[PDB]
Coordinates of C-alpha atoms and ligand atoms in Angstrom, one line a residue:
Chain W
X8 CA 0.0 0.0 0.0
X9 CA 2.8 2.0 0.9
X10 CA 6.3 3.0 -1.6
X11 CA 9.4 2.8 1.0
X12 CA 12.0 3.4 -0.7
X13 CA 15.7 4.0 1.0
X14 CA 18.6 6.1 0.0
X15 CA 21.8 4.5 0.5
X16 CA 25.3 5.1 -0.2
X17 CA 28.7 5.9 1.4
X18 CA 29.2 9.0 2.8
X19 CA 28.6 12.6 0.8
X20 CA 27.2 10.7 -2.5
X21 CA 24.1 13.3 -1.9
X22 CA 21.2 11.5 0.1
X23 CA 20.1 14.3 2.4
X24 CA 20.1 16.2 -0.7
X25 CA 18.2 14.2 -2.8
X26 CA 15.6 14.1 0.1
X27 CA 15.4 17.4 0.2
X28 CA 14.5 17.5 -3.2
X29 CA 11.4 15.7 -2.6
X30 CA 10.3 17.9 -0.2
X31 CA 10.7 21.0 -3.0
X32 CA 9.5 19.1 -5.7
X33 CA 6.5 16.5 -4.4
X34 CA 6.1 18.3 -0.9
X35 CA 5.4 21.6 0.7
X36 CA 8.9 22.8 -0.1
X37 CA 11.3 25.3 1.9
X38 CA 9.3 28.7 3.1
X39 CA 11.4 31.9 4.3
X40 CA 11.6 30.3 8.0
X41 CA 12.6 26.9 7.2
X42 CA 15.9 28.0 4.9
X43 CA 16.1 30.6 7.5
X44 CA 17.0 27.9 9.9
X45 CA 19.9 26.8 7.7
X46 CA 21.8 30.0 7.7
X47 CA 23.5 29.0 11.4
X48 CA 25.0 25.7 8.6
X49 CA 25.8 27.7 6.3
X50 CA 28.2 30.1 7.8
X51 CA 29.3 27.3 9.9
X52 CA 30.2 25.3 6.4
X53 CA 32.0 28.4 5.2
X54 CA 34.0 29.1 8.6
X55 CA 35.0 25.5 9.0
X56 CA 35.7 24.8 5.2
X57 CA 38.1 27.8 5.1
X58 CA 39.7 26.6 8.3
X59 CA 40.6 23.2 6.8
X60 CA 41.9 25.4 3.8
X61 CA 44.9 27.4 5.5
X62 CA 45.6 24.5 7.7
X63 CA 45.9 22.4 4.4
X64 CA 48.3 25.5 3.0
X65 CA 50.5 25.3 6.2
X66 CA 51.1 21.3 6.4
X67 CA 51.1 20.8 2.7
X68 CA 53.9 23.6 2.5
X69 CA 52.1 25.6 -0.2
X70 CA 53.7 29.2 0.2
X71 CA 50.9 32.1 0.6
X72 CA 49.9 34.2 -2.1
X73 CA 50.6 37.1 -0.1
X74 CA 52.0 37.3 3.4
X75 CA 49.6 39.5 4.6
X76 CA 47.3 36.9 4.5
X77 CA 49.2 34.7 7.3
X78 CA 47.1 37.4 9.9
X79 CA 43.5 36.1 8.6
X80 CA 45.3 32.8 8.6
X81 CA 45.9 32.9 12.4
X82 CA 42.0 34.9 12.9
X83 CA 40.5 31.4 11.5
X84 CA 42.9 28.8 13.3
X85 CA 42.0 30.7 16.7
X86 CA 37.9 29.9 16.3
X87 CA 37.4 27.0 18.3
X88 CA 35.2 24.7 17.0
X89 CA 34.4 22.5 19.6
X90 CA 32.7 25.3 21.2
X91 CA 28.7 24.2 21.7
X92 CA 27.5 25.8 19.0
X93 CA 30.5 25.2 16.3
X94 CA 30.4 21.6 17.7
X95 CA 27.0 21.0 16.2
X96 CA 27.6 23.2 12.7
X97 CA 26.3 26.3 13.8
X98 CA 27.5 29.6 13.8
X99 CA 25.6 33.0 15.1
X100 CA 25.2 35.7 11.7
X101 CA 27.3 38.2 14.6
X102 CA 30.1 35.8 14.7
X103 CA 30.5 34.9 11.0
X104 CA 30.6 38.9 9.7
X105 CA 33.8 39.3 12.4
X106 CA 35.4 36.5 10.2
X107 CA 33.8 37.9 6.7
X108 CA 36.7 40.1 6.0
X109 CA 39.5 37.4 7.1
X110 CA 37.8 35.0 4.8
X111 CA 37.5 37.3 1.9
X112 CA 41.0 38.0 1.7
X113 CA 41.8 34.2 2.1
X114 CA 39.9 33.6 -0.2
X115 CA 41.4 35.3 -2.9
X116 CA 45.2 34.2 -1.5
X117 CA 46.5 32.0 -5.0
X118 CA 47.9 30.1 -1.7
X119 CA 44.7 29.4 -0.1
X120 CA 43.2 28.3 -4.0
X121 CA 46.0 26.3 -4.8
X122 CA 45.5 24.2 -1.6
X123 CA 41.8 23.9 -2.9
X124 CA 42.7 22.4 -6.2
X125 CA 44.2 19.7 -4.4
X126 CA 41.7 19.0 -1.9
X127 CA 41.9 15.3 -2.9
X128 CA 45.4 15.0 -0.5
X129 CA 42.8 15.6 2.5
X130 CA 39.3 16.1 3.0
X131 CA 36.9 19.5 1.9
X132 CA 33.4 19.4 0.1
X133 CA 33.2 21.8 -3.2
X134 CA 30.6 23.0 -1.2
X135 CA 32.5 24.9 0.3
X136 CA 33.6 27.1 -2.8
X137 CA 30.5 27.5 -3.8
X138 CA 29.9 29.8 -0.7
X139 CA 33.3 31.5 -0.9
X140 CA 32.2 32.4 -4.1
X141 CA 28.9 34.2 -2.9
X142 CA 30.8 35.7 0.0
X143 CA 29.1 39.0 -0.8
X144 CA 25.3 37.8 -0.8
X145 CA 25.9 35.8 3.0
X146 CA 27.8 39.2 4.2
X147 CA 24.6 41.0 3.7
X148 CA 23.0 41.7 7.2
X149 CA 19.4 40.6 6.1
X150 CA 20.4 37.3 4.3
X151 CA 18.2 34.5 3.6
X152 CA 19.3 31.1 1.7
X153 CA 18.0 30.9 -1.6
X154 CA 16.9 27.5 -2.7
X155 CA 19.6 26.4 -4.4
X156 CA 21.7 27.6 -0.9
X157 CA 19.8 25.2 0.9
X158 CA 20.4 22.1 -1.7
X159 CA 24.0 22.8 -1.0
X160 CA 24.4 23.2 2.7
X161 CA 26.0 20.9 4.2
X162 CA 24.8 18.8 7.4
X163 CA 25.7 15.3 8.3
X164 CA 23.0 12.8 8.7
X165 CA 23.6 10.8 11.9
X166 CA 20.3 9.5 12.6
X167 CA 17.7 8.4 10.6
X168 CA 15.1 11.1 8.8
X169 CA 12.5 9.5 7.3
X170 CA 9.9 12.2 5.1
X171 CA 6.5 11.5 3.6
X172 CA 4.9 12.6 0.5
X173 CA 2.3 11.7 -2.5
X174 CA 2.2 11.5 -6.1
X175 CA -1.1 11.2 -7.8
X176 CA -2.9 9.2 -4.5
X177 CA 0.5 7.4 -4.2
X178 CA 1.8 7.2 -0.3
X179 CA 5.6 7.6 -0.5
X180 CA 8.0 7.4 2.4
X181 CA 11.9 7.6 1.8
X182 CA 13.9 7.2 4.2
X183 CA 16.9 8.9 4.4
X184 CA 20.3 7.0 6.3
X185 CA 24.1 8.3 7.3
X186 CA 26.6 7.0 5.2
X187 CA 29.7 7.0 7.1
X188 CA 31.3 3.5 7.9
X189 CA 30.2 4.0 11.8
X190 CA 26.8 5.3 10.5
X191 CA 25.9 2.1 8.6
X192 CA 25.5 -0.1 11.8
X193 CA 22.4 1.8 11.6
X194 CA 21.4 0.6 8.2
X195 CA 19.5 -2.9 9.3
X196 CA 16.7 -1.2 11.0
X197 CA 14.9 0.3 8.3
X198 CA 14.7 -2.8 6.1
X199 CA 11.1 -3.8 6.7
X200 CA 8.4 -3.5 4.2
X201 CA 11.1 -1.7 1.3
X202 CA 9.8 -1.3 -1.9
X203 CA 12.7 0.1 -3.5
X204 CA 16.8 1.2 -2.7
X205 CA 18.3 4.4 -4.5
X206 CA 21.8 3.5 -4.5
X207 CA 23.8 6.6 -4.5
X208 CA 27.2 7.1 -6.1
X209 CA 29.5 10.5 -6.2
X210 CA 30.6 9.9 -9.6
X211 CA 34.0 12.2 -9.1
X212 CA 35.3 10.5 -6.1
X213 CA 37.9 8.2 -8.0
X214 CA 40.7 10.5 -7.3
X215 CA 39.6 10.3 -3.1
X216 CA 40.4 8.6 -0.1
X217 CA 37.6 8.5 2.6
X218 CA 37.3 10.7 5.6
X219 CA 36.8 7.4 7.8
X220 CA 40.7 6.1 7.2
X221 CA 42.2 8.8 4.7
X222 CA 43.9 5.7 2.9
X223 CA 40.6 4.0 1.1
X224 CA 39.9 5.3 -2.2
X225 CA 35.9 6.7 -2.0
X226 CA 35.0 4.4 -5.6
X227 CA 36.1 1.6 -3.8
X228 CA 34.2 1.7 -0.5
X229 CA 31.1 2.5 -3.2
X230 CA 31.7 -0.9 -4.9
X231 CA 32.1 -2.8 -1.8
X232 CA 29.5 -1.5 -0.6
X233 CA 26.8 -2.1 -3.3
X234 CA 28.2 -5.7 -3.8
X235 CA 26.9 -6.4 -0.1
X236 CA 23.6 -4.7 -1.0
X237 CA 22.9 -5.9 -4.6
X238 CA 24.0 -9.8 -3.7
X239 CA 21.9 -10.0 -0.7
X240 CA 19.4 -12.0 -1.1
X241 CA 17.0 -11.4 1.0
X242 CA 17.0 -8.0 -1.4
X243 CA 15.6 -10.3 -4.4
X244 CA 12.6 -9.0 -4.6
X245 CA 13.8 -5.3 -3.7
X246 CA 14.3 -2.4 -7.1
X247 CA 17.9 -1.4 -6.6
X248 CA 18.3 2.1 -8.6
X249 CA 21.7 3.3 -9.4
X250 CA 22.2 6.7 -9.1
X251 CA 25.5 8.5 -10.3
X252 CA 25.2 11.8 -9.0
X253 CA 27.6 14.9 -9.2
X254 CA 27.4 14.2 -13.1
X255 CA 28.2 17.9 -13.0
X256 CA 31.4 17.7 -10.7
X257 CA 32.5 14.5 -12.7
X258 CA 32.0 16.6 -16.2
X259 CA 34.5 19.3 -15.1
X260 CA 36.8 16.6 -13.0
X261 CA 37.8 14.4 -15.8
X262 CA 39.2 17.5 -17.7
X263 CA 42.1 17.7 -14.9
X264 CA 42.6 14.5 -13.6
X265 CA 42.4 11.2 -15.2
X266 CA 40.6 8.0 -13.7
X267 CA 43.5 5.7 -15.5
X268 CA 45.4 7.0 -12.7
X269 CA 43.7 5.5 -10.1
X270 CA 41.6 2.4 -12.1
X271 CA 44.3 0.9 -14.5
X272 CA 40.9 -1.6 -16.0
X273 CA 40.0 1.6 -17.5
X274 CA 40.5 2.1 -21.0
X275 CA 38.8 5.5 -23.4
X276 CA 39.1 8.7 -23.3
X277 CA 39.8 10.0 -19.9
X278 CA 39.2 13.7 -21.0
X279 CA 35.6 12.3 -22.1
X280 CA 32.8 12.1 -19.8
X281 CA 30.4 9.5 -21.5
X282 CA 33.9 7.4 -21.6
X283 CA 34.4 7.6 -18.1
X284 CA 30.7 7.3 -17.1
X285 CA 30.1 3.8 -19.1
X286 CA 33.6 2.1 -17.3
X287 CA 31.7 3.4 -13.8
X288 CA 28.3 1.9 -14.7
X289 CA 30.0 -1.1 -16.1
X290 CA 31.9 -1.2 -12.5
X291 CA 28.8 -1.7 -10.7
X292 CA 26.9 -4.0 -12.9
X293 CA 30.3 -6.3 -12.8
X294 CA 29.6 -6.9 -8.6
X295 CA 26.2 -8.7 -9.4
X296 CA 25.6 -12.3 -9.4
X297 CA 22.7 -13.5 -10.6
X301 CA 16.7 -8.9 -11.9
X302 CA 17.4 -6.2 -14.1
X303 CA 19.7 -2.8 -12.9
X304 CA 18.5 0.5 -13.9
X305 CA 20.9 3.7 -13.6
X306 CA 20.7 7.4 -14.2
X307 CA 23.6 10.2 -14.5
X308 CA 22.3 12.8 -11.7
X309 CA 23.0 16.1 -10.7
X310 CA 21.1 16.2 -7.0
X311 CA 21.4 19.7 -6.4
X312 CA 19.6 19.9 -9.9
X313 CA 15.7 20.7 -8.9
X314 CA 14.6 20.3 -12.5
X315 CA 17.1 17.0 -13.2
X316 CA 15.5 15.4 -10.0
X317 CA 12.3 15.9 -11.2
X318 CA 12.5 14.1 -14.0
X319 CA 14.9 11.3 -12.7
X320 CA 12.1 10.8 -10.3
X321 CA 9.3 10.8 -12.8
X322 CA 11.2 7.4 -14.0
X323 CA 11.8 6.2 -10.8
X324 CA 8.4 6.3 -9.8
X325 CA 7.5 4.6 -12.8
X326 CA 9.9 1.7 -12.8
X327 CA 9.2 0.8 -9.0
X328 CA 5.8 1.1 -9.9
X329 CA 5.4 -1.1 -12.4
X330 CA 7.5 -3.6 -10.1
Chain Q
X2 CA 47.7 15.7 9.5
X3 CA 45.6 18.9 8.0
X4 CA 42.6 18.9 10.3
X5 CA 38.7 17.6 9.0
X6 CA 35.7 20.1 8.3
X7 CA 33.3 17.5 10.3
X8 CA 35.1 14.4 11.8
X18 CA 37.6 -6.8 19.6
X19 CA 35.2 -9.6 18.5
X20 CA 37.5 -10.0 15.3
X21 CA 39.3 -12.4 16.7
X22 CA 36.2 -14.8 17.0
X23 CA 35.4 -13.9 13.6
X24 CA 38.6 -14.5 11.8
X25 CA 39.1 -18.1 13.5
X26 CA 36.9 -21.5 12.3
X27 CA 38.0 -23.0 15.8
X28 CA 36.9 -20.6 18.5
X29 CA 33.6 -19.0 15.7
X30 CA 32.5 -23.2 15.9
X31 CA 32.8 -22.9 19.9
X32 CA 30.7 -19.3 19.5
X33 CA 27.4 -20.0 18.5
X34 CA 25.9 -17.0 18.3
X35 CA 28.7 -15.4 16.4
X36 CA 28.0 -18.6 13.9
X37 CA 24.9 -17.9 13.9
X38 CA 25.4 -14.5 12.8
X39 CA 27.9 -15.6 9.7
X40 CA 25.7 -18.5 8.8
X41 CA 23.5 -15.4 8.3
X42 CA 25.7 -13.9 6.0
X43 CA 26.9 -16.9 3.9
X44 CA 23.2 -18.4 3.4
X45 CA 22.8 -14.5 1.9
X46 CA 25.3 -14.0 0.3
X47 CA 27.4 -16.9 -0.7
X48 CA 27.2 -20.4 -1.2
X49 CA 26.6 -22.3 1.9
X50 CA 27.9 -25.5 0.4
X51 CA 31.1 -25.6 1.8
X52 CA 30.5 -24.1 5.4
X53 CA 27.9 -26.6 5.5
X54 CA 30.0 -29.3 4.9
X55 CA 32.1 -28.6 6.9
X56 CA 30.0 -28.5 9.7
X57 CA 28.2 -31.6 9.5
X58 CA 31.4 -33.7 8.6
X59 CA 32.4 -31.9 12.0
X60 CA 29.4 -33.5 14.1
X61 CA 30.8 -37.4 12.3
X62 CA 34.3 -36.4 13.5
X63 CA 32.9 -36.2 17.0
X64 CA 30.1 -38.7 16.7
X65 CA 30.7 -42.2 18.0
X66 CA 31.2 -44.7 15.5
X67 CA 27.9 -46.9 15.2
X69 CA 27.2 -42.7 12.8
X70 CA 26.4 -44.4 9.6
X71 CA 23.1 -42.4 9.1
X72 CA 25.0 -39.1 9.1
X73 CA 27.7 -40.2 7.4
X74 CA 25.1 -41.3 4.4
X75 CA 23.4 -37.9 4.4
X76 CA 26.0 -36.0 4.1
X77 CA 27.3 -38.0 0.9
X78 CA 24.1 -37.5 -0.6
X79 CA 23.5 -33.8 0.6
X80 CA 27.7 -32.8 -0.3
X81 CA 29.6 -35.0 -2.1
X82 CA 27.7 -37.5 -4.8
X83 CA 27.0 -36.4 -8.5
X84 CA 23.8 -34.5 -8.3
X85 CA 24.1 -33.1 -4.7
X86 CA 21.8 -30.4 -3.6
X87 CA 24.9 -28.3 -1.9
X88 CA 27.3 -30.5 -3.9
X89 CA 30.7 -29.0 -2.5
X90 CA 33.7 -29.3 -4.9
X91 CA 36.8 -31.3 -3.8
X92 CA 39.5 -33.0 -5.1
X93 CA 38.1 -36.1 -7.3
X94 CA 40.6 -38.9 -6.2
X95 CA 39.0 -37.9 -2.5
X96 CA 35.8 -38.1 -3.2
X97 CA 36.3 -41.6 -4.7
X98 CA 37.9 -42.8 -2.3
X99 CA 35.0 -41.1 0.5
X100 CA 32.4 -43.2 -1.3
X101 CA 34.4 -46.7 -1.4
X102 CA 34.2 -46.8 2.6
X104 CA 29.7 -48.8 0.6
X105 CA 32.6 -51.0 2.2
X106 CA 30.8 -49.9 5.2
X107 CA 34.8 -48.9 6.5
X108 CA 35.6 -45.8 8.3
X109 CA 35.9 -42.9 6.5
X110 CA 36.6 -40.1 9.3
X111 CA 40.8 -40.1 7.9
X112 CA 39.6 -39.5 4.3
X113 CA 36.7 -37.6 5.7
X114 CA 38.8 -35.1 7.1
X115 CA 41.2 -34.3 3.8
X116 CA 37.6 -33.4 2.2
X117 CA 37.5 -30.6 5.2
X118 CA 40.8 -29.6 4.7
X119 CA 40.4 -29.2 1.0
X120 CA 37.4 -27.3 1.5
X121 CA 38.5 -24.9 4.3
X122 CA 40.4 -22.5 1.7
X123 CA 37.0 -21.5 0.4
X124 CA 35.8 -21.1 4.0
X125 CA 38.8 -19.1 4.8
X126 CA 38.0 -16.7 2.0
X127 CA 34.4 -16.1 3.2
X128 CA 35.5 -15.5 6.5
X129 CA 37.8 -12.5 4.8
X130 CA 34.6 -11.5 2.7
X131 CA 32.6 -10.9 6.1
X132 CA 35.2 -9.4 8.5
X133 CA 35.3 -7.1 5.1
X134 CA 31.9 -6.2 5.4
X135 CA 32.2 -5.9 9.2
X136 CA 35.1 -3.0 8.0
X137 CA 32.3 -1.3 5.9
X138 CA 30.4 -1.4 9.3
X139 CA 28.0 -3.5 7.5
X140 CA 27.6 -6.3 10.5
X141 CA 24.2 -5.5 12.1
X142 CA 23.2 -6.4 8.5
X143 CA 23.3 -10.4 9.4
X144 CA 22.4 -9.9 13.4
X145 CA 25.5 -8.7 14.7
X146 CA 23.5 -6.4 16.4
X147 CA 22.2 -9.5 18.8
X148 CA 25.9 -9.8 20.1
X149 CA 26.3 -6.4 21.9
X150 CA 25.2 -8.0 25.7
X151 CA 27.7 -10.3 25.5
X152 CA 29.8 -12.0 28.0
X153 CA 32.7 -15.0 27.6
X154 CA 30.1 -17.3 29.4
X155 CA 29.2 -20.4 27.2
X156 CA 25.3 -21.0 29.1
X157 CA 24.1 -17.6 28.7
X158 CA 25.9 -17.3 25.4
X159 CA 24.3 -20.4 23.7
X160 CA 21.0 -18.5 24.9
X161 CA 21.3 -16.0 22.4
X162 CA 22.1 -18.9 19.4
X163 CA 18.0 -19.5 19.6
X164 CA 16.1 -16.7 18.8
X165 CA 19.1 -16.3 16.2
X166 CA 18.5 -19.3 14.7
X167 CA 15.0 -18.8 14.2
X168 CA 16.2 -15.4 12.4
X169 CA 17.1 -18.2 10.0
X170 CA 13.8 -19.3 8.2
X171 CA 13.8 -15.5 7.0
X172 CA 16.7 -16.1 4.7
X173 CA 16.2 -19.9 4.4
X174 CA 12.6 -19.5 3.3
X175 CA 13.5 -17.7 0.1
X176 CA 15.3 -20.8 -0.9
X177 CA 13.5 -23.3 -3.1
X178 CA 12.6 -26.7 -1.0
X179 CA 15.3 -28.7 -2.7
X180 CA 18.3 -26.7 -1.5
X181 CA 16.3 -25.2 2.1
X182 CA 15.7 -28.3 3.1
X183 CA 19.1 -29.4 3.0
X184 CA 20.4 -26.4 4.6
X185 CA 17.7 -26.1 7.3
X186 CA 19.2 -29.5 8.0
X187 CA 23.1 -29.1 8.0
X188 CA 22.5 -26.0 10.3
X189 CA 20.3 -28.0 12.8
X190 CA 22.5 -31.3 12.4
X191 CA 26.1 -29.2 13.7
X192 CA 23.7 -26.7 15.8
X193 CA 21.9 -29.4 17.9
X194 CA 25.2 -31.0 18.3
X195 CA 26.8 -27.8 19.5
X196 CA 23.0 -28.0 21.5
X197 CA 20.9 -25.1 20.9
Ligands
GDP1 N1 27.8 20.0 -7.3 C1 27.1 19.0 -6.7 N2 27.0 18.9 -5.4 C2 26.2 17.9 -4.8 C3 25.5 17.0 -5.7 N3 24.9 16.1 -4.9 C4 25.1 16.5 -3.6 N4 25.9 17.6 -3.6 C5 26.5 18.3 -2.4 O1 27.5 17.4 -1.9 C6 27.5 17.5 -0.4 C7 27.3 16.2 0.2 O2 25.9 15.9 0.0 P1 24.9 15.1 1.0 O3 23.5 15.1 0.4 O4 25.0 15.7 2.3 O5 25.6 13.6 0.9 P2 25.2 12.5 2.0 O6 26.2 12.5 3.0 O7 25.2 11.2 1.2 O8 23.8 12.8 2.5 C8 26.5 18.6 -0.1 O9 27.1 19.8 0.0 C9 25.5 18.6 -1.3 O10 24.8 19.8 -1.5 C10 25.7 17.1 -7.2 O11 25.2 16.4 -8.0 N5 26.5 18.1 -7.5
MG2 MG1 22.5 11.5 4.6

């Protein structure tokens, strides 16, 4: 009677955002208050992010863009963010504009950017940047997160959300799980009565390691993990749906860096993103071992791409 | 180094020996072979384990599990060297077959071995509450109280059993029982 479908995935491969997506597009979407409320993660994504990005300057040895810079440097290291609120990813609008002017000038420190280009040697969301670059529309005293602000904030999911909706007289529940290794133990108690699994994939994350142990490349831990899923089978009778999402990250990814460094089984064009996205679809199809697998190229911070992924979702499950 | 923006029971599980004196922890990888791999060998294993131990008068079991394991068209056929499995069904001379027995566990325990890899991988993944790990938390080295938890477990079984045509299940339900009553749950 009921659609349960679960998103799952490793860590960061965009299930909070996808389920926030639902809520936009089949829901009652994000008024003023609710973004409102995200504000407190957003500055607290920025502060943080940047934080991680002169740290990475200083260890890595990358030299500063400008010396003058090593002051804002030292403004950032100073906030503590263990500190109640920073501890759970929130920072006051009062705190973040005493930082606003440190940050911009970081920001714009060829140090502080090279350090981002190779994020890959530690551990930063692209997120991130996409905030830096808007600097000027979060300084503003009487800011509130656009749409598209809210798709990209960043909060972890420990716990479970779970969030209802309808299509056409259709009850839907997804269900909404953490994806870091020590958030999985979690993943056994929302198994009854599913109808369907998105499985979730960050299609650019050959190049990383994961934030768990920084030593185990991100693709890896994707394909170990689906091989549990899609071989179970007490799953048999369950639609697994393949999602690649961050199509767009991936598109401007393999134009600098090339998956043959990292997956010697692959063999194309590098520099080509249909080349690139057949050997990962292939990747997952080759763990099976048997049911049909159906897959889609996503973009989950795409409103209009997620409504029509969706529409054939919805379909395919329901004609299952 | 370069800070973060967010930031043992292996033992049992990585040793035959001391995961066969741990029901509950057997329990919980039977679990994940019956799902995801073949149970054949495991299986085997186990039964073959209940002859080694059973006094010799036996003969039922031992005719089971050639039929269930090791003859032509076995349900669970397991696959072992040829010249062993000869020799196995020769001692229809009604002789004892425990030595020969034994090879045909030994020959099987490198593809027991690798399962036991597979799972302690997905334990890594944090994927163990998947196949009942979860059941293991109030756990004490206390074989009674232990053995306690191995029902309940195995009744967790039928759920993955069930989805197993009546030609194989049957079988299985059976080797699981067989080395589970033995070990007396
Ligand atoms: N550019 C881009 N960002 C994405 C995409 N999907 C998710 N994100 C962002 O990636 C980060 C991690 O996403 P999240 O949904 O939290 O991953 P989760 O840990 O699996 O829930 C968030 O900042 C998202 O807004 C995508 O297709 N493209
Ligand atoms: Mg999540």
């Amino acid at each position: 009677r009921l659609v349960k479908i679960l998103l799952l995935g490793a860590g960061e491969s965009g299930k909070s955002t996808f389920l926030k997506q639902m809520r936009i597009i089949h829901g009652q979407d994000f008024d003023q208050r609710a973004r409102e409320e995200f504000r407190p993660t957003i500055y607290s994504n920025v502060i943080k992010g940047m934080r991680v990005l002169v740290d990475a300057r200083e260890k890595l040895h990358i030299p500063w863009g400008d010396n003058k810079n090593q002051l804002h440097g030292d403004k950032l290291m100073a906030f503590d963010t263990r500190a109640p609120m920073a501890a759970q990813g929130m920072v006051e609008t009062r705190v973040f504009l005493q930082y606003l002017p440190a940050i911009r000038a970081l920001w714009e420190d060829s140090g502080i950017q090279n350090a981002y280009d190779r994020r890959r040697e530690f551990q930063l969301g692209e997120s991130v940047k996409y905030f830096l670059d808007n600097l000027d529309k979060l300084g503003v005293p009487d800011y509130i997160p656009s749409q598209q602000d809210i798709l990209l904030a960043r909060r972890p999911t420990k716990g479970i959300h779970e969030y209802d909706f309808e299509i056409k007289n259709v009850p839907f529940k997804m269900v909404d799980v953490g994806g870091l290794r020590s958030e999985r133990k979690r993943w056994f108690e929302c198994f009854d009565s599913v109808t369907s699994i998105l499985f979730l994939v960050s299609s650019s994350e050959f190049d990383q390691v994961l934030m768990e142990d920084r030593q185990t490349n991100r693709l890896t831990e994707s394909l170990n993990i689906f091989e549990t899923i899609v071989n179970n089978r007490v799953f048999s009778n369950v639609s697994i749906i393949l999602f690649l999402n961050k199509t767009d990250l991936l598109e401007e990814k393999v134009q600098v860096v090339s998956i043959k460094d990292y997956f010697l089984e692959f063999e194309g064009d590098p520099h080509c993103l249909r080349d690139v996205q057949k050997f990962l679809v292939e990747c997952f199809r080759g763990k099976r071992r048997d049911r049909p697998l159906y897959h889609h190229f996503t973009t989950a911070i795409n409103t209009e791409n997620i409504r029509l992924v969706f529409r054939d979702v919805k379909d395919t499950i329901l004609h299952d | 180094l370069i800070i973060g923006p967010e930031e043992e029971s292996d033992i049992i599980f990585q040793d035959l020996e001391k995961l066969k004196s741990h029901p509950a922890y057997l329990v919980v990888f039977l679990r994940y072979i019956l799902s995801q791999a073949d149970p054949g060998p495991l299986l085997f294993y186990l039964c073959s384990e209940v002859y080694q131990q059973t006094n010799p008068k036996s003969r039922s079991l031992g005719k089971d599990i050639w039929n269930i394991f090791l003859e032509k068209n076995a349900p669970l056929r397991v696959k072992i060297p040829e010249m062993l499995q000869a020799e196995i069904d020769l001692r229809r001379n009604n002789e004892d077959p425990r030595n020969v027995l034994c090879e045909a566990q030994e020959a099987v325990m490198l593809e027991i071995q690798e399962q036991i890899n597979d799972y302690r991988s997905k334990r890594t993944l944090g994927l163990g509450s998947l196949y009942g790990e979860n059941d293991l938390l109030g756990l004490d080295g206390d074989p009674l109280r232990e053995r306690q938890m191995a029902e309940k477990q195995l009744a967790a079984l039928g759920d993955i059993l069930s989805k197993y045509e009546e030609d194989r299940s049957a079988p299985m339900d059976f080797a699981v029982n067989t080395f589970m009553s033995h070990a007396g749950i």
